[PDB]
Write a protein that binds this ligand. Structure first.
Ligand SMILES: O=c1ccn([C@@H]2O[C@H](COP(=O)(O)OP(=O)(O)O)[C@@H](O)[C@H]2O)c(=O)[nH]1
Ligand SMILES: O=c1ccn([C@@H]2O[C@H](COP(=O)(O)OP(=O)(O)O)[C@@H](O)[C@H]2O)c(=O)[nH]1
Lengths: 264, 264
């Protein structure tokens, strides 16, 4: 179809940030056009996931649903970080899709180390998510951009003084009470390999300083992620369609699709 | 202020294309944030303008108004292409701003040649406009992106079969009747130096082929510009606030600012 300049793509939600980064909601994008632009570059997407201790139990559904909904038609490489390589279930993968097992403050440190490895040279973007989740609907190249965060589903409706940023000024994650654009969740972020290198390195180095000063930020790496994305603004922001909990929050009308949701 | 996820930045216009490029309207951007991000990189903007024959008469107002409204606070280098160097008026410039005179199918060919010169090595973005115009209001770094076009003020409300694309299939500028996103005007386009190299080279090479085949596209380089931007989609699109004619079109309510307008 033809975009119509005089008709809003959505009349109920903000679809662009004040720094002109798209906020990704159903009805904002034509997936056919995006798929073509990304296929033209033979894009490869790395997906990182941690499954430590009892969390290995979530991988089977996480992977099977990824195969149905995540970047289908594109090249995908899953990187599973685990303390149990033998517990990784053997999930059949579509063509162009691969999985590697990496045996293991941790997430940022580890992604930062892995992100700098030469075997990542084929990969174009990295997407970093929680494992206690399942895909229910399309998650595709509409998310891909140099740097993106995701709105925490519990705060997208909130004002900034209510955001659980780190408020102690001795913490590297410190954000003053009248500062802040959005509250991003540490459960889904990513960007090009270079931007994810920069982000995870910055968060890891900041946390190290906090540790050397006897402070642990209130929400741990998520606090440092919010500090980083305040100072280095994401080039796309994912709407809560991309990170949801239907048991705790239902299915409000503003969410036309629930794409990637908590497992009960 | 704080962006509010549940409140549209505009309820009367489309603010993002179906490929997630921002469409730049007043109320979509916080200029303070954009100015800071661009100052952090010490951005230099080149502005190209042609003033041939009687058109040299428009430079004095074009330049004086540019100095009031165009990229103020950033580094700017005007490139005036003229058959009359002595007719270039001597306009006083703000700090960080410079002007060069270049003595002269033409616009694309010439920008393409100039855009590949090494003396452009300081410049980060190129903006290419008509000279029979004046700035009335802010035109700033909100436009800057790898590739942008501007909606032709006469067609932003139209359907695509009404767009004056080149319709003969022997022309390189050929666009089929059920294809097309927008009709862009050849009076205001730009992007990073590299994307403007690519665009002007493509349009110039396409026109050369049309000439070698005894065809002139209906709207000349604007036809080839539309063909190029159909196949290589702009990363921002400027709303008609950025290219207007108040004598012919008035001041409709959807235009909250008239930034860059035709001289009567
Ligand atoms: O014992 C654990 C605790 C956490 N995690 C990983 O760290 C993420 C964050 O924990 P939860 O998912 O427990 O955190 P929120 O994402 O903080 O609910 C999980 O998704 C897993 O990917 C893990 O693998 N094993
Ligand atoms: O004799 C001419 C004709 C055109 N132009 C340049 O080419 C642009 C396009 O012409 P007009 O402005 O006459 O074209 P539209 O932009 O086609 O009205 C002008 O803005 C000038 O920048 C010029 O300098 N001298």
């Amino acid at each position: 179809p033809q975009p119509k300049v005089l008709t809003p793509s959505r009349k109920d939600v903000l679809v662009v940030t004040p720094w002109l980064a798209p906020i990704v909601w159903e009805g904002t994008f034509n997936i056919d056009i995006l798929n073509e632009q990304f296929r033209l570059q033979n894009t490869t997407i790395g997906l990182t996931v941690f499954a430590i201790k009892k969390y290995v139990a979530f991988l089977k559904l996480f992977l099977e649903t990824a195969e149905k909904h995540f970047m289908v038609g594109h090249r995908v490489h899953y990187y599973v970080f685990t303390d149990q390589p033998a517990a990784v279930p053997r999930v059949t993968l579509g063509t162009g899709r691969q999985l590697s097992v990496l045996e293991v403050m941790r997430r940022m440190e580890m992604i930062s180390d892995f992100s700098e490895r030469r075997f990542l040279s084929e990969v174009d973007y990295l997407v970093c998510v929680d494992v206690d989740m399942e895909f229910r609907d399309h998650v595709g190249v509409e998310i891909l951009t140099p740097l993106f965060g995701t709105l925490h589903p519990s705060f997208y409706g909130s004002s900034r003084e209510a955001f659980t940023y780190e408020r102690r000024p001795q913490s590297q994650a410190y954000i003053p009470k009248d500062e802040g654009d959005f509250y991003y969740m540490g459960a889904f972020f990513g960007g090009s390999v270079q931007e994810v290198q920069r982000l995870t390195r910055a968060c890891h180095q900041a946390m190290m300083v906090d540790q050397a000063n006897g402070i642990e930020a209130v929400w741990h790496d998520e606090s440092h992620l919010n500090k980083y994305l305040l100072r280095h603004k994401p080039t796309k922001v994912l709407s809560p369609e991309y990170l949801w909990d239907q048991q705790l929050l239902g299915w409000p009308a503003v969410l036309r699709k629930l794409r990637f949701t908590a497992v009960p």
